[PDB]
Amino acid sequence: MLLNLDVRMQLKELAQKEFKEPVSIKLFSQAIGCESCQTAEELLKETVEVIGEAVGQDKIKLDIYSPFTHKEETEKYGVDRVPTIVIEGDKDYGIRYIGLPAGLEFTTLINGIFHVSQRKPQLSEKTLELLQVVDIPIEIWVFVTTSCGYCPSAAVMAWDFALANDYITSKVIDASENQDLAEQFQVVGVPKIVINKGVAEFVGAQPENAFLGYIMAVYEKLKREKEQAL
């Protein structure tokens, strides 16, 4: 098992106290040409069964798709790499994990599930008040690794921002598994955050208000470009 009795006991308690609304998890995976996929399928099944047993089989479900077969699902969630994990509820908040959320990123996965289950992001009222103005699609990528010590914090923060706004999409991308993307954005130290594929970037975990700041700076520029273009 990827989750020993101790971790299961822990996740079970965690779920019972933290879990609320039903959660949907969609894993896009492929048998050949993807090294971490099999492990991702295994980790997610165990996670879902553990949580499902703790709060109810109907509170959480895992769908595993293959881009080759599930063209519709793949297209809908903008999946182009595997494994890609979608955490959502009634709606798609643009929360994605590209790669295996193992190591220190496992809590990222767990916290993503819980935050989504709670239909509530862990962002101050100040942040949420200011963020609601964002109404132009903003994409957030957080490059991480399973051992990166500050990534979990950055990854969950990006996911919360996505959960807080219907125009924000946040993808936590394992830099080891997506070296091509990593290189393309000169990812060396992690976490490295990239907004709108290069419009802006910053390194390391960020105080919530600074992370908001980047998003808002990117948004204001997109806003005026949207206005001037009239």
Side-chain angles (χ1 to χ4, degrees), residues 3-230:
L3 301 184
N4 60 51
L5 302 173
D6 221 294
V7 185
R8 296 191 164 217
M9 193 65 266
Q10 171 176 36
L11 181 56
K12 177 183 189 176
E13 287 176 47
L14 217 314
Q16 284 174 168
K17 308 162 189 169
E18 297 297 298
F19 218 78
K20 296 180 182 176
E21 313 276 57
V23 180
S24 182
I25 297 179
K26 293 171 186 177
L27 167 62
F28 289 76
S29 190
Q30 62 182 53
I32 288 177
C34 172
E35 184 198 55
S36 68
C37 280
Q38 180 185 59
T39 302
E41 294 183 42
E42 279 160 33
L43 182 62
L44 292 194
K45 287 181 183 180
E46 284 189 48
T47 298
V48 163
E49 74 163 89
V50 166
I51 297 181
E53 198 291 312
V55 303
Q57 156 285 306
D58 63 310
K59 301 281 189 303
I60 183 173
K61 72 165 302 192
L62 170 65
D63 282 299
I64 303 178
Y65 302 116
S66 293
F68 173 74
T69 294
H70 309 93
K71 181 180 180 180
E72 193 189 72
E73 292 71 18
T74 304
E75 179 176 54
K76 178 176 186 291
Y77 289 96
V79 177
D80 61 340
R81 300 169 180 276
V82 291
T84 291
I85 300 177
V86 176
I87 305 175
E88 63 182 13
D90 272 297
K91 55 195 292 192
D92 180 7
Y93 306 98
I95 292 175
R96 318 268 187 275
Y97 196 96
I98 301 179
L100 179 65
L104 299 174
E105 288 307 312
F106 180 59
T107 79
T108 294
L109 172 61
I110 300 306
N111 289 325
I113 293 174
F114 290 156
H115 289 202
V116 172
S117 176
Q118 283 153 30
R119 299 293 130 95
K120 159 197 176 187
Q122 291 299 304
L123 300 174
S124 74
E125 284 312 81
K126 183 187 183 306
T127 297
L128 292 174
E129 172 63 49
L130 224 172
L131 191 68
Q132 55 183 49
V133 65
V134 174
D135 56 8
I136 301 179
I138 289 177
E139 176 167 34
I140 305 178
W141 292 350
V142 183
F143 288 94
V144 308
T145 65
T146 54
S147 48
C148 167
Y150 284 119
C151 288
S153 156
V156 179
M157 182 168 281
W159 277 354
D160 280 339
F161 273 100
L163 176 57
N165 187 287
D166 295 325
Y167 290 87
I168 300 179
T169 298
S170 292
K171 305 181 178 191
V172 175
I173 310 173
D174 180 283
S176 305
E177 289 182 53
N178 301 278
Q179 295 163 307
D180 58 303
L181 261 191
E183 275 165 40
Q184 185 185 314
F185 289 84
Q186 196 158 54
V187 181
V188 174
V190 288
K192 181 165 184 179
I193 301 76
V194 177
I195 303 184
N196 283 198
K197 309 173 185 184
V199 169
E201 314 164 4
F202 48 97
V203 171
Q206 309 292 317
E208 181 176 313
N209 192 239
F211 202 119
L212 169 62
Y214 285 116
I215 296 175
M216 298 314 301
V218 169
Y219 171 74
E220 199 175 314
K221 176 178 174 60
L222 295 175
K223 192 183 180 191
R224 182 169 301 171
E225 294 185 315
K226 184 182 188 182
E227 306 177 315
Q228 287 173 170
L230 296 175

